[PDB]
């Protein structure tokens, strides 16, 4: 099926710190596989997935040296941004970046990504053509003009269509069985009493992977639903629940449909009184 | 394999 790779980078400055903290996290198919943190006693990229543990020492050394260059890039950029926004002293500031590639089921490159944020808001992004930039405001227009004049997009396009795709292929080969591993939701419906002639029905979806899931309540297979946002269980799997307010004695007329990748077909659930 | 940013800063 389709695949992806992303690196999510963050640098945070603060008055009490002489140098910004830098964190880089790599993901393959939305699962963390590598991490670098400047706060560690010995900062280095480390494997975050066991299938990455077989990469030799030259790989770890090469990635770690790149992170040192990124820390400098982010440090200088943070200082420029403080100037662009004429920000006052005594504040903490955040520069973030996302980059990577999306691959189709037929292995073609669907899209390259490159985006930046300052203070948690879009700053500048590389357009889908991998040639032009979108600047979010007046300060980002200063950056856009700089990057157009220096030809920055060409460097980013070459990485996104080349090296990004090549390495994603290599990781997919190593993490083959592990990355294709899905966990089906184990589902059940709970009964909760209410005021008047009414009752709450809660459809629980547990132990599933990946996080993408759909829970749908229906009245005879065809009010606004209440739910919780998908949450991590702590073991690598996810949880979710969806609820409906129904009249007393009418519980069996309502069904909860669970849609997930790991299931051979959608689940159909109902309140089963013990 | 992580990206190293083109040397021009923001």
């Amino acid at each position, epitope marked *: 099926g389709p695949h992806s790779m992303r690196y999510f980078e963050t640098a945070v400055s603060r008055p009490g710190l002489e140098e910004p903290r830098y964190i880089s996290v790599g993901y393959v198919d939305n699962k963390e596989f590598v991490r670098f943190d400047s706060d560690a006693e010995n900062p280095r990229y480390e494997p975050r997935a066991p299938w990455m543990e077989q990469e030799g020492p030259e790989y770890w050394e090469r990635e770690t040296q*790149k992170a040192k260059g990124q820390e*400098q890039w982010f440090r200088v950029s943070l200082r420029n941004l403080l100037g662009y926004y004429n920000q006052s002293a005594g504040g903490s500031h955040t520069l973030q970046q996302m980059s990577g590639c999306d691959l189709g089921s037929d292995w073609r490159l669907l899209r390259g990504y490159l985006q930046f944020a300052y203070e948690g808001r879009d700053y500048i992004a590389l357009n889908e053509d991998l040639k032009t930039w979108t600047a979010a405001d007046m300060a980002a227009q200063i950056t856009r003009r*700089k990057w157009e004049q220096s*030809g920055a997009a060409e*460097h980013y396009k070459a*990485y996104l269509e080349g090296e990004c795709v090549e390495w994603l292929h290599r990781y997919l080969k190593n993490g083959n069985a592990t990355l294709l591993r899905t966990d089906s939701p184990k589902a059940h419906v709970t009964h909760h009493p209410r005021s008047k002639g009414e009752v709450t029905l809660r459809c629980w979806a547990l132990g599933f992977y990946p996080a993408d899931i759909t829970l749908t309540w229906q009245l005879n297979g065809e009010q606004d639903m209440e739910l919780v946002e998908t949450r991590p269980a702590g073991d690598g799997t996810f949880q979710k629940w969806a609820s409906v307010v129904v009249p007393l004695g009418k519980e069996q007329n309502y069904t909860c449909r669970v849609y997930h990748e790991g299931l051979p077909e959608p689940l159909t659930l109902r309140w089963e009184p013990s | 394999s992580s990206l190293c940013n*083109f040397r*021009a*800063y923001v």
Partner: T-cell receptor
Amino acid sequence: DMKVTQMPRYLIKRMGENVLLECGQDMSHETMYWYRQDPGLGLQLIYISYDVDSNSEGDIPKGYRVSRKKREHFSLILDSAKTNQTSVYFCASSFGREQYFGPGTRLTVLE
Amino acid sequence: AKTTQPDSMESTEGETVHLPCSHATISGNEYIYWYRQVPLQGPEYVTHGLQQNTTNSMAFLAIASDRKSSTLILPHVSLRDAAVYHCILSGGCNYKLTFGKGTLLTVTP
């Protein structure tokens, strides 16, 4: 538009004396450089400055030190000049495309 | 360091000059830059490229398909073009340049 300034074009110093070479760049580029060039040879990097107080030794740092307190200026200091320090010194700056070079300072250190 | 150029090249004004440059060990994100240095003045940027052939007011840059060699082409050379031409690799994420001896181009009238 892009201009790196270096004065004087020429300087004579006695061996053992302090030397200070100054470089200016009004473009406020983050990156500045000091190179030296001996006759018939390519430029050799002495020090690079990535920003204010963010200096890194180049290929030949011995006998030199630098100062970058402001983005617009970059100083090269010879605490005790040696006759082998006779050379043409070029300062450069960059914003991330090419490097822009100053007109150079010819320094002759004599016994 | 990674680039190899002939030490000298002779040419006559009005002729097409091809300045070769060998860089077999070039990495994917290394740009090919050309700088020139007239008698004793500071070096000056001529052109640069990554994979594609580049045309600008000063010169034409031809980069081989495998990127292991390149050529700086100076059409109808003038006396003003006599200089040392430096072919240098510039990594896309860094600010350093390692100058070599380059090619001293003489232009006879």
